[PDB]
Amino acid sequence: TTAKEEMERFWNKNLGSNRPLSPHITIYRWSLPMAMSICHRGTGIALSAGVSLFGLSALLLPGNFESHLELVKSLCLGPTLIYTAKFGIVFPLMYHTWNGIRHLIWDLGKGLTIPQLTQSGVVVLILTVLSSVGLAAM
Amino acid sequence: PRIKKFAIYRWDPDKTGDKPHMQTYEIDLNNCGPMVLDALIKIKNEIDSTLTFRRSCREGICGSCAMNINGGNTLACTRRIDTNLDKVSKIYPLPHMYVIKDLVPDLSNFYAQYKSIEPYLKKKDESQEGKQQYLQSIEEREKLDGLYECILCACCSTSCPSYWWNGDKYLGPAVLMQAYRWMIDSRDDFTEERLAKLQDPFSLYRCHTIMNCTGTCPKGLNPGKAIAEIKKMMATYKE
Amino acid sequence: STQYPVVDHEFDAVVVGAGGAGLRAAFGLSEAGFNTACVTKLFPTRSHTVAAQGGINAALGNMEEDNWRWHFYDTVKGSDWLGDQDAIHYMTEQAPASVVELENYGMPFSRTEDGKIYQRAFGGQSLKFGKGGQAHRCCCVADRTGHSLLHTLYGRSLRYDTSYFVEYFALDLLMENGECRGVIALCIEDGSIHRIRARNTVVATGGYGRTYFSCTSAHTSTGDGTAMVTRAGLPCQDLEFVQFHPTGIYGAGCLITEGCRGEGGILINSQGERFMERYAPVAKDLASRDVVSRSMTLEIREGRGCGPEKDHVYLQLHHLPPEQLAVRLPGISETAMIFAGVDVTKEPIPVLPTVHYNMGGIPTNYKGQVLRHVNGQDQVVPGLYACGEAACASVHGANRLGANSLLDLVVFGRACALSIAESCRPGDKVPSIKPNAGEESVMNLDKLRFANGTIRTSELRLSMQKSMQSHAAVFRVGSVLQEGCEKILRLYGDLQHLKTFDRGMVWNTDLVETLELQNLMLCALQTIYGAEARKESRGAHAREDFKERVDEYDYSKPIQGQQKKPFQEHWRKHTLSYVDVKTGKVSLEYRPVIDKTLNEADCATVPPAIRSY
Amino acid sequence: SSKAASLHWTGERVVSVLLLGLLPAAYLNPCSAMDYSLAAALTLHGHWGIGQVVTDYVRGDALQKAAKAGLLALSAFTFAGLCYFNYHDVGICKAVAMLWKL
Ligand SMILES: *Cc1cc2c(cc1C)nc1c(=O)[nH]c(=O)nc-1n2C[C@H](O)[C@H](O)[C@H](O)COP(=O)(O)OP(=O)(O)OC[C@H]1O[C@@H](n2cnc3c(N)ncnc32)[C@H](O)[C@@H]1O
Ligand code: HEM
Ligand SMILES: CN(C)Cc1cccc(NC(=O)c2ccccc2C(F)(F)F)c1
Ligand code: SF4
Ligand code: F3S
Ligand code: FES
Structure with missing residues (x-):
């Protein structure tokens, strides 16, 4: 028998039988490294959705950009109410940027021990809250 | 007398219409060993001789008793029982695996993947083998440390979320580290084509450095580090 | 029986066992060209051999200049002259050749200043036939040598078309009129029964350490092949000879290596004195396993205890260099921390003599053939072979020499393959x-x-x-x-x-x-x-x-004015044991030890002498 | 004897460091020339980004065929949408600047 035949006979046996898949998402213990990879997907997808909505509306929706700004100005420009929108845009962007650097540091080969992971994970998490408050204040 | 509670995953294939369920066993810790396997065998010997599980060395150097205890894939003979009596130890089979019976997963695909990487010394001229000992400098031997020690418990691979979703086409942490183990071996001549065997999007590039592999390894090894080191070789190697 | 589906398999050769000997014999046959099946109840990597820590003996001469004939002497001297010298010759000569073979397969042996395979001192080994002092010939992969042996032997066995019956509990030998036909086995996965028949059968099922309460061996060391032989009415050899490894953790019953003593480990009693120099002056704490354990077990009976309830002794690593316990012995560094809760660099290891090796087993040729005993004479069982710990070619005899089993595995695993390759061809009449x-x-x-x-x-x-x-x-x-x-x-x-x-x-x-x-x-x-x-x-x-120590002569005094004792009056002979399955009656016969070598001119017979270091 | 998977991985990390460099470069030197390069890097990295998500979760021969097409259609429209905005409207840099002091 060969390696490819063993894999081919593996699936043929299990799928045609009443064997259950052992629990995975339900049972596995969470950690900071774990959770921080979910967010990088989330932020990546949310940011791509944001960019796409900005591009697609330009071709579909009529008027110039200044026309759309005056449309937002119709509601009350609350000093802390508009801060919510301004923070809610940058927060995922900056997290993904900081965590993206951490990913690039990893692909370079450095910082792949369990202590260093949880260390650099916090650094990314802290830089986010600081840069997101710092940019919303601009 | 200290009483510890164990909640264990149970499934019988020979019982008609038996659905997976949890079964609780209580154990006195005074006349029992310190490790989880010591407890597992104690309920096997006395309380219920239906609890089917894999055991061998009880030494942490074979990889039979690999299972998910308290949300972590480790060896039961190495993991000591939490002396906290109020907490109930939840024992599960290796995550996202076909259950043969109780805590016994079908590792056939896993082993098969290890066969596909060719984990054996390959020289371009094997006519002179069996008579001369191959020379390897003491520094080239240091390169294999942290890699050869792998016991193939499947703990790391079965902890990888990407290996859950793509177990069929992605090799996983354990298997990939062994591919690397035979890459940097100074005696191996096939370093180039060992990398070319990974030139599809699934074999190697299904890793996203989630790092669950190195975190859960019972032997303390670092497969993820090696996997990232493979990726580096893939972008640099020529011809 | 109308409940069980029987699926018959047809092969050239069946190897029962996936240890060191089991694997080497398996793919060795496939390499020779044979359609080979390998029946194992565990996955090949889980085989005990994985738990091996010490090393593998070969007279490669990488530390000093060495001769395999000096290794021959050490093994037979260690065997207390119950060791068959035809088998010891074959093994010690093949020692350097078989190791080189493994390193070429891809075994990651520790290296030297020169770049060759790192050898180190071990218990009972001496240069120049015992005269030249300490000997360094134990080849090792750091402290995980058996693990690496098994993995590279398994790894190499994927290169050949061997039919692996993974997790198949072999029940009994398929026997017909003396000649062996194969094995009947239970499939653990679906509960089915398979009659795997072949021309030659190789039994390599390891020791039966689980017969005792405290053993270093795995839970699956249950002497299964041994039983299959006695259920066939065939004899077993030297089964009373069970090795008690001097150093094994008192707690769970785990093992720390003899390589602890090989590098520079010391044994400490009640006072703190090196008590092993009190027993053996020349070899000290690095003496044969039967002598070292004899000291430790008797030390407790003196009242000289060391534990909380005074039962176990000590192996001290308080003085050994920190950097030495990282490249030479890193495997025991972790395993002592888990079960005993002991830091190896500062705290001593608690140890007790516990069951380790079964030098007894299935009677065997130097060619690996199983031997029945008929009319006081030897006789080969057709199509039945045995190698490794489960076998007994009596290379170890009455007492196994340190780090010789992993050699015994590779050498006699290979020997079983070669004896089949010569006696018949692949694709011959499978009976x-x-x-x-x-x-x-x-x-x-x-x-x-x-x-x-x-x-x-x-x-x-x-x-x-x-x-x-x-x-x-x-x-x-x-x-x-x-x-x-x-x-x-x-x-x-x-x-x-x-x-x-x-x-x-x-x-x-x-x-x-x-x-x-x-x-x-x-x-x-x-x-x-x-x-x-x-x-x-x-x-x-x-x-x-x-x-x-009863021999055919009184070997203390000069050999001349002595009348030779009859065969049925001394005790320098192999214990052959039969057992009636239905009543449990044990009947015993005895066959003589082999003293002649394969070549006297190349390796002289070592006559019996006094057993002390 | 091609290595397309390795080059694609390398390409991803190159556009990642390019996009990382472009963000502060846009803040420092905001122009039409920075708008298009930001429109190029922004769509590319994202297109290869979701491309990984698709290859991870989407199981099937008929589904991945449609998903990779539908993603390409979106990515093409996204790049065209940004380029139109850079040419006929204020451009990315100016749009963010106007939106911020609001
Ligand atoms: C106990 C021990 C011994 C030991 C050692 C460490 C320990 C904990 N370290 C050693 C060392 O460092 N150097 C050395 O020279 N010797 C050492 N020893 C002894 C040595 O390691 C063992 O004796 C040796 O490994 C035995 O090898 P062998 O191949 O003969 O046996 P095995 O490793 O146990 O493998 C047996 C295989 O056979 C299959 N099997 C068993 N029963 C069945 C049945 N029922 N049906 C089908 N298959 C069966 C198993 O699957 C197993 O793989
Ligand atoms: C300049 C800041 C950014 C950096 C440094 C960066 C870096 C990275 C890297 C290296 C990855 C690959 C992670 C991996 O799978 O190994 C990634 C994931 C991803 N990024 Fe970015 N990126 C940035 C901004 C953005 C933006 C603006 C978008 C929106 C278009 C985006 C969308 C995505 C998507 C969709 C993924 C895939 C999700 C995943 O597989 O985890 N990124 N980022
Ligand atoms: C580890 N838990 C239990 C959380 C959990 C549950 C389900 C999916 C995930 N995580 C992913 O799905 C994931 C996240 C980032 C990159 C790649 C992936 C993956 F490769 F596709 F697997 C995590
Ligand atoms: S790398 Fe670690 S977790 Fe993975 S199989 Fe080996 S010992 Fe187990
Ligand atoms: S657990 Fe899987 S994600 Fe890649 S580094 Fe991780 S192998
Ligand atoms: S049984 Fe050997 S590792 Fe747990």
Whole structure:
């Protein structure tokens, strides 16, 4: 028998039988490294959705950009109410940027021990809250 | 007398219409060993001789008793029982695996993947083998440390979320580290084509450095580090 | 029996076992061109051999200049002259060739300044035939040498088309009119039964350490092949000779290597004195396993305890260099921390002499052929081979030399392959077995599957293990051995009253451990009866009443004015043990040790001498 | 004897460091020339980003065929949408600047 035949006979046996898949998402213990990879997907997808909505509306929706700004100005420009929108845009962007650097540091080969992971994970998490408050204040 | 509670995953294939369920066993810790396997065998010997599980060395150097205890894939003979009596130890089979019976997963695909990487010394001229000992400098031997020690418990691979979703086409942490183990071996001549065997999007590039592999390894090894080191070789190697 | 589907398999050769010997024999046949099947109850990597820590002996001469003939002398001297010198010759000569073979397969041996395979000192090994002092010939992969051996032997076996029957519990040998036809096996996965028939059968199932309460061996070391031989009415050899490894952790019963003593480990008693120099002056704490454990076990009887309840002794690593305990012995550095809770660089290791090696087993040629005993003479069983710990070519004889088993594995695994490659060709006539053959093994299986007695499998196992531990320890007297014999015989009748709960086909660990119990018992009976009958202190088997080493001559005084003792009056002979399966009766025969070598001119016979270091 | 999977991985990390460099470069030097390069890097990295998500979760021969097409259609429209905005409207840099002091 060969390696490819063993894999081919593996699936043929299990799928045609009443064997259950052992629990995975339900049972596995969470950690900071774990959770921080979910967010990088989330932020990546949310940011791509944001960019796409900005591009697609330009071709579909009529008027110039200044026309759309005056449309937002119709509601009350609350000093802390508009801060919510301004923070809610940058927060995922900056997290993904900081965590993206951490990913690039990893692909370079450095910082792949369990202590260093949880260390650099916090650094990314802290830089986010600081840069997101710092940019919303601009 | 200290009483510890164990909640264990149970499934019988020979019982008609038996659905997976949890079964609780209580154990006195005074006349029992310190490790989880010591407890597992104690309920096997006395309380219920239906609890089917894999055991061998009880030494942490074979990889039979690999299972998910308290949300972590480790060896039961190495993991000591939490002396906290109020907490109930939840024992599960290796995550996202076909259950043969109780805590016994079908590792056939896993082993098969290890066969596909060719984990054996390959020289371009094997006519002179069996008579001369191959020379390897003491520094080239240091390169294999942290890699050869792998016991193939499947703990790391079965902890990888990407290996859950793509177990069929992605090799996983354990298997990939062994591919690397035979890459940097100074005696191996096939370093180039060992990398070319990974030139599809699934074999190697299904890793996203989630790092669950190195975190859960019972032997303390670092497969993820090696996997990232493979990726580096893939972008640099020529011809 | 109309409940069990039988699926017959047809091969050229069947190797039962996936250890070192098991694997080497397996792919060696495939490499030779044979259609080979490999039957194993574990996954090949889980095989004990993985737990091996010390090293593998070869006279490569990488530290100093060495000769394999000096290694020959050390092994036979260690075997207390019960070792068959034809087999020891073959192994010691093949020692350098077989190691080079493994390193070329891809085994990551530790390296030297030169770049060659790192060798190190070990117990009972000496240069220049015992005269030249300490010898360094133990090749090792750091402290995980058996692990790496098994992995690279397994790794290499994927290169060949060997049919692996993974997790298949071999029940009995398929036998017909003396000649062996193969094996009948239970498939653990679906509960089915398979009659795998071949021309030649290789039994490599390892030791039966689980016969005792405290052993270094794995839970799956249950001497299964040994039982298959005795259920066929064939004899077992030297089963009373059980090795007690001097250094094994008191707690769970785990093992720290003899390589601890090889690098520079010291043994400490009650006062703190190096008590091993008090017993053996020349070899000190790096003496043979039967001598070192003899000291430790008797030290507790003096009252000189070391533990909380005063039962275990010590192995100290308080003084050893920190950087040495990272490249030479990193495997014990972690395993002592887990079970004992001990830092190896600052705190001493608590140890007790515990069951380690079974030098006894299935009687074997130097060619690896199984031997039956007919009319006081030797006779080869057609198509039946054995290698490794389960075998007994008596390379180890009365006492195994340190780090020789992993050699014994690779060498005699290879030997079984070569003997088949010469005697017949691949694709030869595979003899047919009766349609109703092996049915009694199936019926035995069915009886234990639906077993409903008064004593549970686990409780009877415990009753066997504790019985052997107190009656057949390091020291034993005829008085205590007699009580142990009738106690074990009583427990064989208790097998009728076995209780089994799991009634399933798929993965019945309750059934297979009960099958293992049958095997363990059959090993125990031959061990204890052979021990009580042997009235001498040879090798590991030491008698307080018969403290003398009884040979065919009194080898203390010059060999001249001495009348030779008859064969049936001394004790320098192999214990052949039979057991009637239905009544549990143990009957014993005896066959002489082989003294002649394969070539006198190349390797001279070493005559019996005084056994002391 | 091609290595397309390795080059694609390398390409991803190159555009990642390019996009990382462009963000502060846009803040420092905001122009039409920075708008298009930001429109190029922003769509590319994202297109290869979701491309990984698709290859991870989407199981099937018929589904991945449609998903990779539908993603390409979106990515093409996204790049065209940004380029139109850079040419006929204020451009990315100016749009963020106007939106911020609001
Ligand atoms: C106990 C021990 C011994 C030991 C050692 C460490 C420990 C904990 N370290 C050693 C060392 O460093 N150097 C050395 O020279 N010796 C050392 N020893 C002894 C040595 O390691 C062992 O004796 C040796 O490994 C035995 O090898 P062998 O191949 O003969 O046996 P195995 O490793 O146990 O493998 C047996 C295989 O056979 C299959 N099997 C067993 N029973 C069945 C049945 N029922 N049916 C089908 N297959 C069966 C198993 O699957 C196993 O793979
Ligand atoms: C300049 C800041 C950014 C950096 C440094 C960066 C870096 C990275 C890297 C290296 C990855 C690959 C992670 C991996 O799978 O190994 C990634 C994931 C991803 N990014 Fe970015 N990126 C940035 C901004 C953005 C933006 C603006 C978008 C929106 C278009 C985006 C969308 C995505 C998507 C969709 C993924 C895939 C999700 C995943 O597989 O985890 N990124 N980022
Ligand atoms: C580890 N838990 C239990 C959380 C959990 C549950 C389900 C999916 C995930 N995580 C992913 O799905 C994931 C996240 C980032 C990159 C790649 C992936 C993946 F490769 F596709 F697997 C995590
Ligand atoms: S790398 Fe670690 S977790 Fe993975 S199989 Fe090896 S020992 Fe187990
Ligand atoms: S657990 Fe899987 S994600 Fe890649 S580094 Fe991780 S192998
Ligand atoms: S049984 Fe050997 S690792 Fe747990």
